[PDB]
A paper describes a structure:
Here we have extended the resolution of the PBCV-1 structure to 3.5 Å by collecting data using a direct electron detector. The improved resolution of the cryo-EM map resulted in the identification of 13 different minor capsid proteins and an atomic model of the viral capsid consisting of 6900 polypeptide chains. This is by far the largest viral capsid structure that has been determined to near-atomic resolution, and the first near-atomic description of a NCLDV capsid. Each icosahedral asymmetric unit of the outer capsid shell contains 28 pseudo-hexameric capsomers with 6 of these in the pentasymmetron (a, b, c, d, e, and f) and 22 in the trisymmetron (A, B, C, D, E, F, G, H, I, J, K, L, M, N, O, P, Q, R, S, T, U, and V). P2, P5, P6, P7, P8, P9, P12, P13, and P14 are present as a single copy in each icosahedral asymmetric unit, whereas the copy number per icosahedral asymmetric unit of P3, P4, P10, and P11 are three, four, two and 12, respectively. Three rows of P3 and three copies of P2 construct a scaffold that glues together all the capsomers in each trisymmetron. The N terminus of each P2 protein extends to a neighboring pentasymmetron and glues together one-fifth of the pseudo-hexameric capsomers in a pentasymmetron. Neighboring symmetrons are bound together by the zip proteins (P11). P2 essentially acts as a molecular tape measure (or ruler) and determines the size of the viral capsid. The icosahedrally averaged near-atomic structure of PBCV-1 shows that the PBCV-1 capsid is stabilized by a dense array of minor capsid proteins (P2–P14) inside the major capsid shell. This minor capsid protein shell cements most of the gaps between neighboring capsomers and uses transmembrane helices to mediate inner viral membrane association.
Residue numbers in the entry:
A (entry chain a4): 98 to 147, 152 to 254
B (entry chain a3): 218 to 288
C (entry chain c9): 5 to 170
D (entry chain f9): 4 to 437
E (entry chain l5): 136 to 193
F (entry chain g3): 3 to 49
G (entry chain d1): 3 to 436
H (entry chain j1): 341 to 436
The structure:
């Protein structure tokens, strides 16, 4: 008899974007080192945190078993920016604020469609800076073939 | 750009050995600039399709023909 | 290390009338059994189909399966268990007034018949999952085996020329 | 359905990356230093019709490839009387290395080979080098060039390293036909005053510079080469009242690339089809003078399958069908479509065991040295069509042919296989005998 | 004896499945009688004390 | 059709199929020794 | 079935499938630099007309260039059969200049010779369709012709010319239009009254590179291994009725030469490389009462009938030494291209390759005439004794003779195709060797 | 299939067993568990003139002799398994 | 014409057949076509000369499930309460004037 | 007659469809046969009385692999870069004696197209991409009185 | 006037109970089987 | 003269329950079908007028 298999998540490797590394665009900046990028739509509630599983940084819990697929790829959180709990300009606020939703849908708020690794800067501090919740990648609108602006998850 | 972009490889009308017959390289198995009969992916041990450097899998070629390359 | 793969499997089936028997005050499960038997309420019947006896049987089926196989199984659906109990009950129900002796035999038959289906049931499921999960059976060249020619003509293939000795 | 699948929402965005290669800037490979020279060989024995002659290839260069046998013939009649006569003339050629036969071709093989594997302008140019194709008349004199088609005569990649064969000689033995149509005989009738052929054998030699020449001279070498296997047999001749059938043992060995065959009337070289009173199908066809017992020699070949004799065929291995029975037109038209890409004349058939039988690179073979019972099973067409009545021929059905098709009594079965020619310590021969 | 204990099998939690198939006991009689279950009398039909004695009573 | 025969199982069948011991859908051929048989002519003495 | 072949596995399979290296059931692909191609019209400086010299300059619209097609619009000055590749005849020559340096130059005759040797089958036919009238068009008919250029960058993406890297050098093309074109504005020596002047336009196919490739071209130095054509005209040692003329022609060539090519011709009639005769297609009106052997059937100027070719035999000498044994003209006409190209060469056109495959871009053996102080082409001509007006005299003739009209082939054209290096640096380009 | 002999015309067998001609049950149909079993028979058209060999012998699959109308009786038999039990000097069948 | 089938699974999603849960069993339909169809190939008992034969095609509407629903169907047992049609034909007593 | 198909997998071994890898999926070919075929059952618009109905057979050339490769295909995921044909029929902006018609045709295509190809035709006559004329080979009876 | 044959193919199927059906569906099997080998030959023709 | 073909890009957004469409003569409200001389299919349909 041959032993059955579970989710078996598919994870790619982070790439060199010039003086920094980041996860490729169809993927998310999941976990670290062994599992750096998620490819499939769900992944292994990575334990490393702060320590804590949420879920972690860029994915949110779903109502399932098989830890390997308990977080769904492509989300974040309200992430307070300046004085308002807005999603990043390139993110889509679902509307699931928290109070009007159950635990699973309350966490799945920003729908990071087409912006899983990089986003654009925001006119928040009056200076066009990297969103409060992300790392400040050195690229600009003049720089070609790199539409992402200061951002990384 | 930090990429070892090679020269072109077109279908030539003459077979050519790469002058490295004792170590059989894998980059010359898919190079159409030397062979002329047929083209196949290089099989590693236990009949595993080993993709040599420079070439790309069919899914990667589809991603490069639809979405685009990089810099 | 197999904990997760095992944990991953649901323990709660979205079954028609999940929690099918008991969990209702409209009428007892004993009565349902009596009605299909077409027998009067009586100590033999009210002990055999009682919740404590149904529970006894369910626990034995679970425990014995776990003892006999490597598998952990749930309680069985009770329409299936009631129908089986009543079927067995109709074809036997033989006692001289000794309810305890009668019950011992009837429980023996129910537990035994249930295990005759369960033990192979478990096997069938486990083998099913193998096939449902893994391509073809999850096996290798053993399954994808071409016939062996197995004839001797090839033994006579000879060299065309002999090298000089060196 | 409990297996794992992938949504692939952006699988391709994930799988992209940098360019690997650019189309607009070619790098040419630096090659070795060599030169090519065409050198005449000495032919021993008297050359003439029906004679057996031979030549030893002189050690003038290091490696050899192309070999062309020149012949000079004069037409013994007018245009329409000859058909590839220089091809017919070279009845056969045998390649011997170290005294061991490596290969051997026949005039009919050259005709079959050409009919099956050459094409387009190459085939035409070939015909120019072996026949008269511009309506030449009696007495016209031409030099013909018959290229040989041994493995080393097709590619430098298999150049024969004479330099590596210091103890062994390489020879060609050539049989010249006793008769050549339209040159010294018109059918069975000798042509009075016909001239004997002039013959010359040319070998194109490769001269290597020191580093490569030395490696060849000193190192052992293994060349993957192609050999012809061949034998003729009686055809289960079809007739007006019946569909003949025949179980033919295929006495072949080695990893075979393909089988090829034809039926023919041994009377007339290259005749693989029946004769008929339709244009080009017989001498005088289309006119009152038409005779369906003699071909229009200049137009002996045809693509009109109505004149072919194979209804269907299958090949069995170890007594079992290798593929489902297919019609003769499958072997004639489809196999070549798939495997060659040229056009094959009616009466010529192919069954490949290889993806690309026309090339050098192995692409699947049938090892007959491991097969106990290889049999070709043929079913012939009913010979009920009156060949002298075009309507009877042109309007016929799939399962029938010309009454004159029963003259195609000879069957030639050929096979090409891959062996290894090994050279070492100045000597060589085949890796395998069988 | 068939199926050699497969301790490496991961789905050992077969609780979500109902293996009992009570399809063979639908419509049976006391031992082997054939009367289409004979639900004729609209009453309770009490239990008959069938004691497993030999061919005779005593 | 045939499935209804499988379903129609009673007390009477216990002596035929309860606790199966055998099956009709599997045969076992028993491995035997190696031997060969030959027909040989004998010499007849007398007349 | 197929399994019966797979099971037939043994020792002779090891050299074909043991330790497999590739699988034919899986294609491997390469990520190529993204690009696009756009067709852009260039203008013409100078007045377009017969006998005029005009030119263009290729603008830097794209980064690299390859194919160039010159369009012409011509009318028929006579009926079908009066023209022969007239757009090819019209474009008398094209000179390629980079930075003012002459890089290369093609001639109308070269285009004809090139085609005769290297194009084939439907490539050749489709080519003819773009330069001639091949559907029996009549006087007054007008068509657009497309004459592709054959400079090294016009044959493969691999040699796309790096306009991008030539910041300070323009690429120009000078086109000479013939003063007369047969069947268009002249009929033999006679002008055609009312003939229209050609309309001309030069089209260039530009390659647009992505950012990364574009950058490399701008920053890196480049070199290309390219082809050049060397060409001179010579008088033919005209043969005659009583003799086989012979001639030693100095081969004033340099650089690594891939091959030589040559023909003999009648300067009056474009593409005429053979003698005229009263046999179908061999002369104007051939085969009938109106036949003349002073003018060709222009639409059938070319032929594969060698009997009308002038050359008997030839050899190439290097520094007075034979390079190969003397071979017959038919060897250069038929065998050389069989071996080296795989197409069919018309009578009167000859090839001698120094390369294994001269039809390709990859060098495969060259004769470097920069190291041969005195190369010579030695030609022997046939005796011009055959009366061209008597079909039998021609069709029934011998190997060493030709038509009396072969003495009209007074010109000899010798070409040599060689390899040089085009270097690009600091925004400028030019050849490495004189 | 089930016996290996030859059965005379007019006699029909349907087996529920692999080898009904033997002792080992080898498959049975328990009719005590079948609420309503039915044998459904279709008869031939009895239009053949029994007194005329041409009609008797040259006829079609779906027809028979006019005299077949006289075959008015049908006998249906079945063979089944019961258990003969013997105990304490007495015995009989387990199932009634 | 479109003849919908009216089997229990053809009436509601709630009784869809889980082909996914039937790895070792096939699901098949069998269709008997009438020898005669009124006004199409026959008019009462009379055949209609030249009548065309039908073109037939069976279309099945499939449900594609996402990851969790799909997985549960594949691994859990499934029970549906379904309908069946029982049928028998017979001669009527014949009434008369 | 033998009509080869030209789908991507029908052109090269490199794109052979891995039926062994399709444990649960079938591969089908649907073939529509023309209502009429010129010179076979119809002469222009006229049906040909007595014309035969076609006999058809579909042949597939299968590749049998050895054990290691059969297993590989059966177990591993496979991706093949393939070709597809997109096609739409349009009404031609038919030209006339006094005018050069012109037409803006929307190219309702998607994907990385390798090339476009097109033709104009007379739908009446299969394969007719050009006008008819009384010149040899350009019409029925061309070159003569008929 | 000869009629064409009407043909039908019938197969006798074995319906297994749950325990055995499962094993057949799930487990590997080995069956010793018989095969017929056959070739046709020309008979040397005997004569008077 | 032809079976017209069309490919209409649908510039829709949002989670769509269904699509619906019709062809019509914009002249006549609600006309989704062709006119004909059969009862109800045109003004005066079925008669000379």
């Amino acid at each position: 008899v041959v032993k059955p298999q579970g989710y078996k998540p598919e994870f790619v490797n982070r790439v060199n974007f010039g003086k920094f590394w980041a996860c490729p665009e169809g993927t998310t900046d999941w976990g670290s080192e062994d599992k750096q990028c998620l490819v499939s739509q769900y992944g292994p509630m990575m334990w490393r945190n702060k320590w804590g599983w949420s879920c972690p940084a860029g994915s949110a819990p779903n109502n399932s078993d098989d830890w390997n697929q308990k977080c769904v790829q492509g989300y974040s959180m309200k992430k307070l920016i300046d004085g308002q709990w807005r999603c990043t300009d390139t993110e889509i606020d679902t509307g699931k604020d928290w109070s009007n939703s159950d635990w699973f849908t309350a966490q799945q708020q920003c729908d990071r469609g087409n912006n899983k690794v990089f986003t654009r800067r925001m006119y928040i501090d009056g200076k066009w800076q990297c969103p409060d919740g992300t790392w400040d990648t050195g690229f600009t609108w003049s720089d070609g073939e790199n539409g992402g602006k200061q951002c990384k998850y | 750009p930090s990429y070892q972009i090679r020269n072109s490889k077109h279908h030539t009308q003459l077979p050519m050995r790469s002058l490295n017959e004792p170590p059989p390289m894998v980059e010359d198995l898919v190079d159409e600039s030397l062979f002329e009969g047929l083209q196949g992916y290089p099989v590693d041990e236990k009949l595993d399709l080993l993709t040599p450097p420079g070439t790309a899998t069919p899914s990667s070629e589809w991603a490069a023909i639809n979405y685009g390359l990089t810099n | 290390g197999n904990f997760i793969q095992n944990m991953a499997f649901p323990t709660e089936n979205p079954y028609k009338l999940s929690g099918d028997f008991g969990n209702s005050t409209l009428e007892p499960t004993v009565t349902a059994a009596l009605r299909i038997l077409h027998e009067s309420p009586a100590p033999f019947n009210t002990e055999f189909f009682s919740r404590k006896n149904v529970d006894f049987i369910q626990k034995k089926l679970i425990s014995e399966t776990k003892r006999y196989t490597s598998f952990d199984i749930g309680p069985q659906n009770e329409d299936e268990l009631i129908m089986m109990m009543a079927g067995i009950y109709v074809q036997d129900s033989t006692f001289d007034g000794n309810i305890k002796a009668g019950l011992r035999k009837l429980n023996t038959l129910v537990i035994t018949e249930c295990l005759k289906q369960i033990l192979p049931g478990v096997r069938a499921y486990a083998l099913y999952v193998r096939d449902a999960s893994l391509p073809f059976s999850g096996g290798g060249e053993e399954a994808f085996k071409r016939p062996e020619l197995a004839t001797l003509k090839g033994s006579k293939v000879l060299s065309g020329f002999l090298p000089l000795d060196r | 359905g409990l297996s794992q699948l992938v949504a692939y929402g952006a699988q391709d965005v994930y799988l992209t990356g940098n360019p690997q290669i650019t189309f607009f800037k070619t790098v040419y490979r630096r090659y070795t230093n060599f030169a090519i020279e065409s050198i005449q060989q000495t032919i021993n024995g008297s050359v003439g019709f029906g004679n057996k002659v031979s030549t030893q290839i002189s050690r003038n260069g290091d490696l050899i490839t192309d070999i062309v046998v020149e012949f000079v013939l004069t037409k013994g009649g007018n245009g329409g009387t000859t058909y590839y006569p220089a091809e017919e003339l070279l009845q056969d050629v045998e390649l011997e290395i170290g005294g061991q036969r490596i290969d051997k071709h026949y005039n009919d093989w050259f005709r079959t080979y050409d009919a099956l594997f050459r094409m387009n302008d190459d085939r035409y140019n070939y015909r120019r080098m072996t026949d008269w194709v511009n309506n030449e008349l009696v007495g016209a004199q031409k030099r013909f060039y018959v290229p040989l088609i041994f493995f080393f005569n097709q590619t430098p990649g298999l150049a024969l390293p004479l330099i590596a064969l210091q103890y062994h000689e390489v020879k060609l033995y050539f049989t010249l036909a006793s008769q050549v149509q339209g040159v010294n005989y018109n059918g069975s009738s000798a042509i009075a005053g016909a001239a004997q052929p002039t013959m010359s054998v040319w070998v194109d030699y490769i001269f290597l510079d020191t580093q490569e020449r030395t490696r060849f001279a000193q190192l052992p070498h293994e060349y993957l080469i192609e050999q012809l296997q061949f034998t003729g047999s009686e055809t289960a001749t079809p007739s007006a009242t019946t569909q003949a059938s025949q179980n033919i043992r295929l006495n072949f060995n080695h990893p075979t690339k393909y089988l090829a065959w034809n039926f023919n009337n041994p009377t007339n070289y290259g005749q693989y089809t029946a004769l008929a009173n339709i244009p080009g199908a017989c001498s005088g066809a289309g006119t009152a003078a038409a005779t369906v017992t003699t071909p229009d020699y200049g137009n002996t070949g045809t693509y009109n399958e109505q004149l072919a004799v194979l209804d269907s065929a299958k090949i069995q291995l170890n007594g079992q069908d290798r593929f489902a029975t297919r019609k003769g037109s499958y072997f004639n038209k489809v196999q070549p479509y798939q495997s060659i890409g040229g056009v094959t004349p009616a009466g010529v058939y192919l069954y490949s065991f290889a993806l690309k039988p026309a090339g050098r690179q192995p692409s699947g073979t049938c090892n007959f040295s491991r097969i106990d019972n290889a049999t070709l099973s043929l079913t012939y067409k009913t010979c009920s069509i009156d060949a002298t009545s075009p309507a009877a021929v042109l309007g016929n059905t799939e399962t029938v042919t010309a009454n004159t098709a029963t003259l195609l009594t000879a069957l030639n079965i050929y096979a090409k296989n891959y062996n290894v020619l090994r050279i070492m310590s100045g000597m060589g021969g085949l890796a395998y005998a069988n | 004896p068939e199926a050699a204990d497969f301790a490496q099998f991961a789905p050992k939690n077969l609780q979500a499945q109902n293996f009992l198939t009570a399809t063979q006991w639908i419509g049976v009689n006391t031992q082997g009688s054939s009367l289409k279950n004979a639900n004729y009398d609209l009453r309770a039909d009490p239990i008959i004390p069938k004691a497993d004695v030999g061919p005779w009573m005593m | 059709g045939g499935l209804s025969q499988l379903v129609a199982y009673g007390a009477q069948d216990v002596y035929l199929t309860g606790n199966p011991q055998i099956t009709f859908f599997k045969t076992v051929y028993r491995r035997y020794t190696n031997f060969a048989i030959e027909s040989i002519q004998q010499t007849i003495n007398g007349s």
